[PDB]
Amino acid sequence: ALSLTADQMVSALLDAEPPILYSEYDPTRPFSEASMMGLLTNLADRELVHMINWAKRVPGFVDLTLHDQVHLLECAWLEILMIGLVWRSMEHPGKLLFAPNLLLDRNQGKCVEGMVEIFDMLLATSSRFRMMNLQGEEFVCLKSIILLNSGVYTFLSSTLKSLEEKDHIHRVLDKITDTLIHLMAKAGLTLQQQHQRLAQLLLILSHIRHMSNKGMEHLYSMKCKNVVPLYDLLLEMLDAHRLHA
Amino acid sequence: ALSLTADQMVSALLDAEPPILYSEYDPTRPFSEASMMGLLTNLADRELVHMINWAKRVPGFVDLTLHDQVHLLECAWLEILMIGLVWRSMEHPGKLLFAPNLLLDRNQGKCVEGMVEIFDMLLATSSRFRMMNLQGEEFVCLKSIILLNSGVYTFLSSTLKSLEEKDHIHRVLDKITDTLIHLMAKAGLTLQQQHQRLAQLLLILSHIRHMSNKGMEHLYSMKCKNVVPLYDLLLEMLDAHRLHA
């Protein structure tokens, strides 16, 4: 993503966006009978498949080794789901738009032990986004930064290959920084407002990390899923042949 | 911190730095006999007292209500210890400088179940700092951002007071952003390198959040301490009289 213009990065990222999926419950049937966590887990599993396709279209990602791609997604997948949730919840004060047919308030989260704490964090993030007037162009930049950043400090090694990979990633993160500043300049913010808004945006990423960690903690205490480790499922998805070319 | 110059912010922050404390073990006695976690916990408890004094000298902090001060420190204290640890470990490749008389490598962390995972994260952060050539002026800015940012999205309320507080905090974070850019400009980086370096710095804060969350998880499974909730201990420390004026 190192010779692509800022305008080329932005349209690539807008072109790569995944679809908005629906919850799978029968809407002709009552609600007292649906497992909220089963509904949420099924939604999340379905989104993950589309996340892999998206990641492959983030400039620079597929130039990485397959191992490193798996590591980055293993590190970032919940941050990536959550920022997407807060983004589509932005125009819906007090509610989380998990899917177009599944819009939940905080009292619906009390439905699950320990879940209202996570709901409240997501809702607050959504409110911050709304107050900053975050733009779709800025959002796709931030989601790609999460992908490239969250796992880059935990690669074990420091083989020559590994050092080359880290370098490449930092290079791509740097172009996305240039892209966010370009977007802001185009919008006519001053120099000073650009850097202030860039910092405001990147500091929310620390909150998103916090919510992912808390949600991983919460998830690891119910039924959700942990059959076949995540790494292997990600590897299968990412390690594609080219036969269906 | 909203009429203070960038140069005034930087010297206030340099003036506020806490002291480097020593580990309390008898150095005339063997090491096989010291509880590494007891040594680390005692060090951390001692640093906390000095952290409160530091926080009160961060521009804008004491203009907050006492409740909000307690909340911010309750949210950020482990991130603040850890960034300080990685900073003083920077010139010591492969080791963590917990104190001048307590310099540990990763094999010394294996000493505690589940601790080498945290050590490895801290060491990697330290290596990133060293590779970025982080400067003492940039460090104190980042530590103050952690203080003001980590808890600002989780205040419950939205009383008028609460909305005023959040506004003030964002205002102070904005001046620290201006300060980091000033520092970088003074150093003669280009416009482009400034924004890139600002983003590189703020993205490491997401890793520091990650390490704090993982370390809180790890800490909550041993002896460390949880007698009298943290809030109340922080409140006592922060709720000072002015008699010793």
Ligand SMILES: C[C@H](COc1ccc([C@@H]2Oc3ccc(O)cc3S[C@@H]2c2ccc(O)cc2)cc1)N1CCCC1
């Ligand atoms: C089994 C596990 C399910 O993961 C989940 C399950 C549910 C959700 C929960 O539901 C969604 C659904 C879609 C989405 O875009 C975001 C969320 S967030 C929420 C949640 C997250 C953490 C919590 O502690 C509580 C609620 C998010 C992720 N698989 C997901 C794909 C890889 C593993």
Ligand SMILES: C[C@H](COc1ccc([C@@H]2Oc3ccc(O)cc3S[C@@H]2c2ccc(O)cc2)cc1)N1CCCC1
């Ligand atoms: C009892 C609790 C002790 O907290 C601790 C105890 C030990 C340390 C450990 O030792 C220090 C000591 C000083 C310092 O500046 C950083 C660290 S980090 C490390 C550690 C952190 C998390 C882990 O899972 C493993 C190692 C850091 C914090 N009190 C600290 C003051 C408030 C509560």
